[PDB]
Paper text:
The [name] RNA degradosome is composed of [name], a 77.6 kDa enzyme that possesses both 5′−3′ exoribonuclease and endoribonuclease activities, and RhpA, a DEAD-box RNA helicase, with a molecular weight of 55.8 kDa2,7. [name] is essential in [name] and plays a major role in the degradation of both mRNAs and antisense RNAs8. The central importance of [name] in post-transcriptional regulation in [name] and its participation in an [name]-based degradosome prompted us to investigate the structure, oligomeric state and post-translational regulation of the [name] [name]. Here, we report the crystal and cryo-EM structures of [name] [name] that assembles in tetramers organized as a dimer-of-dimers. We also show that in vitro and in solution, [name] is in equilibrium between dimeric and tetrameric states and our data suggest that the tetrameric form constitutes the active form of [name] in vitro.
Numbering used by the authors:
A (entry chain A), B (entry chain A): 139 to 691
The structure:
């Protein structure tokens, strides 16, 4: 008869990013976050994946609202794509709603800005059968929040994405007293960031970058270029401040970066004088030591713009042999080779490059082991659910929690789809639902399921041999020459004559075929596809997609 | 009238691996190395690239021999593919020729073992107009050699791939006296490893792994699995030694690893007792704490076998919840995400994993800054050509050489294709030749040019809309229903009705077309492809490959 809650991860447990969780009691439910995950970044763009909203359709009538905790694409990137299907009230801080509404406007969903509900921190608010409080927490992004969620089964604490920065840039450190209060009163369950679970110590403060920026700007003798992604408002704000400190005119390239900076300037999060800024067309009018350019690309991209500038295909900015390029790309693990490619192209143009002191190692943004342990000691949860990471990350976080006196039996390692019931005296997995991903094109802004692309590559890897046969069923013979085309199987110079060698085979086969096969085009097409498949495998040791068409006209 | 040489990099300047250089005097030439480059590694295999041998056909009548310096796939992997086109005498140490002949036998080129010529170290040998001496040098692999190449223009020193290890595993440290002698006598040109140019200090000795192995084997309570690639004979030899130290029976999985180990055992490089080894089918007969398994996959692969064992699709070895898995994969930068995937699958099976102390950071294998500086001070070259790396690597190496008192004007940064003439008093680029790569399938063992694959993906990225039209030119109308198929453009559920919507369009178009278009199928096919292209772009914002076929029969 005792109460309980049901935690359903739809994204964030199996990948870094793409966070979406469902906290559900009987007759009520809330959804925490709707994020985008970036698995790879190359010279031509980034891969983007959004979660699958299939389960939300099943519990549509229990959802009391979407809870937004971070004003960043890894937590609000999927909201436009979700609101194309379902709509619920969106609780969030001003900047979070400001950047979500910007994307909504870009997507033609300005209508759903109607659903926005602003919240302030240190102010509990009733949403459904939940009492939610936003608690300020430090992180790399401009606005971050932990959640204190009171339910009749107990209080849940959701940190999710955080670091402990005692000297942040905005001088708004973590509201430590509230986190401790909830812990003294008693906490049933804690969900905590597991991204940086494998690193000991604490993560360095964002203020440890200020001296590096100051040194790089002090001794810069030409233009300064700052390459990053559209949602690094904090880093771009730190860089603009140091540009105006050394009397440099700022030129921001990229419509999304300027919008995001303007949304934050208007809402009062950042202070930026207009007179320090110029347009790209004006950069050539100023001497080189008075120029700071800030470059971004499409959503999540950093190095496509750098590659276009280093190849002279950008057509707005060209790399010059006195330039200093500061690279602050997204921490997409497995990006080193692409950074190396951009670096090669930039060194060819005789440009100095600073990239190490802005990598993921110097600032990780996510809580390291000491910060995770501080969270565990502040909250003192009875049950623990490590979130925001792959399986090995949350496993290491469970190890840390065990070292902090949390019983191993009170920690479950969730995977996307898993459903876990939590009560004031137990924790257990109760089942699985339909979880998945969907690829997203950052240029055309549409979602395509991972199944469609799996197939595109199930064939796009290996070639595709097309064929067309025209026979006269009443003569039982080829009527018009068979026609063929191929792609990706083998280079053309070896397929112009293999095309003639599979044509010969088929002409003979057809003349030698039973009239029934020739009379019914389907049997002929199946017969033909098998003939060709065997012929191509024997010649290439591949099994290309084979498409055949037969005619009897 | 003074002599000079001509250095033509065909591979190794723009990528890590795939090394092939041509040192050419008028009327004579030698080729140093024929390597394989591994740019990416995933859960299903590795990418393999070999250099383009086009220039070697032009200078075929000057080549006095192929010079092999390292017994490893990154220096001898392309030799079978090169010998399918041209043949020259192959100078090499026993193990180098032993592993090259093994691959030759696998490729059906045992005939060309006739071309082998064994060499010993500290023994100058005349090859063409060159006097070549192999000097022992330390490195991660079992046998490595620097080259001292006397020409009438001066003496060239080729280190290429090296580290300075004062306590190697074989107790055969670098022959430092010979390198110094050549330097005192005078050296015109030096080519040196630039792979690890960005790291300060010295690289740790291979003996710093022995305590880690000993600790891991001491406290292993179940089976021990050692996952690596077919050519890590040294690491697999270190691991087998520690397995027999703790009374574990060794089970080697992978035909290539056993062959390479047997080639080295017979030639006397390694000492391995037969009685310590067992077959895979026998591992279940022994208790878990008496079992060391060694796993490899295809050429260069490490984690495909691990993934198959962790998914229970291996069918010879299955991961058990007491296992300890030591990962020693190839240092292919940009592999972190794939290692993380394998790690997730292994932790799901409750297996302990050791991977950090066998990463690239703990042992780099390539000379760091102090070792590069030691080489520069030992050789004292007048001219310097940094090799074995991308552009930023060789640029950093040039910086180091400048700091070592080498004039900036005596250092050139080559790129694949560049031709550089070097004389006893000058250095300059004289032109460019045709350089390139070719992808290699590790299962079927054939080369496919990067052009063929570029195209496979120029279309395999985006979809491919096929179509067939049957018209009667004397009625000027569709005779039989048009037929269509698609792949990768959009999921099927949205293309079954778009296929009907492009069919309708075309039926009308055809009936409305000029008789000339209908009379000549080529014009009809071009007309049709353009119609469809516009229709598909408007619906998908994509430009899929479009293949059309028209019939008038």
């Amino acid at each position: 008869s005792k109460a309980s809650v049901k935690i359903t991860p739809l994204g964030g447990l199996g990948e870094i990013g793409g966070n979406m969780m469902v906290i559900e009691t009987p007759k009520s439910a809330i959804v925490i976050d709707a994020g985008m995950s970036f698995p790879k970044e190359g010279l031509f763009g980034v891969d983007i994946l959004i979660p699958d909203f299939s389960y939300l359709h099943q519990i549509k009538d229990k959802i009391a609202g979407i809870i937004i905790t971070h004003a960043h694409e890894d937590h609000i990137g999927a909201t436009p794509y979700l609101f194309k299907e379902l709509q619920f009230p969106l609780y969030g801080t001003p900047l979070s709603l400001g950047l979500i509404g910007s994307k909504f406007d870009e997507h033609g969903l300005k209508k759903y800005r109607s659903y926005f509900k602003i919240v302030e921190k240190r102010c509990p608010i009733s949403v459904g059968e939940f009492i939610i409080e936003w608690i300020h927490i430090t992180h790399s992004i401009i606005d971050s929040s932990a959640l204190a969620i009171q339910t009749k089964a107990g209080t849940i604490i959701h940190t999710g994405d955080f670091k402990i920065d005692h000297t942040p840039v905005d001088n708004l450190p973590t509201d430590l007293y509230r986190l401790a209060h909830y812990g003294e009163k008693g906490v049933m369950l804690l969900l905590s960031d597991s991204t940086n679970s494998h690193k000991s110590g604490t993560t360095p403060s964002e203020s440890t970058i200020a001296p590096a920026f100051d040194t790089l700007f002090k001794e810069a003798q030409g233009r300064v270029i700052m390459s990053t992604f559209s949602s690094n408002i904090h880093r771009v704000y730190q860089a603009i401040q140091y540009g105006i400190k050394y009397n440099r005119k700022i030129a921001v390239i990229g419509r999304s970066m300027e919008k995001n900076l303007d949304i934050a300037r208007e809402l009062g999060y950042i202070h930026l004088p207009y007179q320090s800024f110029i347009e790209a067309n004006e950069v050539a009018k100023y001497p080189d030591n008075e120029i700071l350019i800030v470059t971004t690309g499409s959503q999540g991209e950093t190095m496509s713009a750098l590659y276009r500038m280093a190849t002279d295909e950008h057509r707005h900015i060209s790399i010059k042999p006195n330039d200093l390029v500061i690279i602050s790309a997204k921490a997409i693990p497995g990006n080193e080779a692409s950074v190396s490619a951009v670096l090669n192209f930039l060194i060819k143009k005789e440009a100095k490059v600073a990239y190490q002191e802005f990598d993921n190692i110097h600032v990780s943004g996510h809580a390291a082991q000491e910060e995770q342990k501080l969270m565990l000691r502040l909250i003192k949860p009875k049950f623990f659910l490590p979130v925001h990471g792959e399986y090995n990350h949350v496993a290491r976080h469970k190890q840390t929690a065990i070292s902090c006196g949390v019983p191993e039996k009170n920690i479950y390692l969730m995977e996307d789809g898993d459903q876990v019931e939590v009560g004031p005296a137990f924790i257990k997995k109760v089942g699985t639902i339909k979880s998945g991903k969907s690829y997203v094109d950052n240029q055309s802004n549409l979602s395509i399921d991972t199944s469609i692309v799996q197939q595109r590559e199930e064939v796009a890897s290996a070639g595709v041999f097309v064929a067309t046969i025209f026979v006269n069923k009443n003569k039982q013979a080829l009527l018009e020459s068979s026609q063929f085309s191929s792609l990706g199987l083998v280079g053309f110079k070896d397929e112009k004559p293999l095309i003639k060698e599979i044509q010969g085979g088929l002409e003979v086969l057809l003349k030698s075929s039973n009239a029934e096969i020739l009379n019914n085009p389907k049997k002929l097409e199946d017969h033909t596809r098998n003939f060709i498949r065997k012929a191509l495998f024997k010649k290439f040791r591949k099994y290309p997609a084979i498409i055949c068409h037969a005619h009897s006209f």
